[PDB]
């Protein structure tokens, strides 16, 4: 379910940012993520929130649910 709600949101943000092109210099740097950066490092860099902040995309909404699932997993395990 997390992948179901993350992949569609990433595709939606890509469609929105393609609709709002606004030709500039840094948009190609922000769009190399889709063509380059194979799914390995793509998922590696889109899944990072343990510190205060990272370069996480607009889905801050799924971060809360993933943190909830992790907390549930750790109380299920032996970690207090």
């Amino acid at each position: 379910d997390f992948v179901a709600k993350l992949q569609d949101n990433q595709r939606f943000r890509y469609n929105e940012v393609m609709q709002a092109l606004n030709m500039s210099a840094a948009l190609t740097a922000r769009k190399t993520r889709e063509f380059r950066s194979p799914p390995q490092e793509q998922i590696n860099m889109l899944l990072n929130f343990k510190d205060d902040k990272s370069e996480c995309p607009c889905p801050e909404e799924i971060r809360d649910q993933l943190l909830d699932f992790h907390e549930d997993l750790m109380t299920h395990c032996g970690i207090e």
């Binding site: 997390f2 992948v3 993350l6 992949q7 799914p39 390995q40 998922i43 590696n44 899944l47 990072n48 343990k50 992790h70 750790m74 032996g78 970690i79």
Partner: protein
């Protein structure tokens, strides 16, 4: 001179979840999230009742 200089200058579905699992295992689980290396020995060295369990 400036003119000369100017002249010289002119002259799909399951792959995603599998990769998510791999990334979650790689950068979310082993990130220093447990402390037991003192309590374990503390309760292991107790001879509650011979040779202690840690001595064994």
């Amino acid at each position: 001179x400036x003119x000369x200089x100017x002249x010289x200058x002119x002259x799909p579905r399951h792959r995603a979840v599998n990769l998510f699992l791999q990334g979650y295992e790689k950068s979310w689980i082993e990130t220093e999230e447990h402390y037991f290396e003192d309590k374990l020995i503390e309760d292991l060295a107790k001879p509650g009742a011979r040779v202690d369990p840690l001595h064994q």
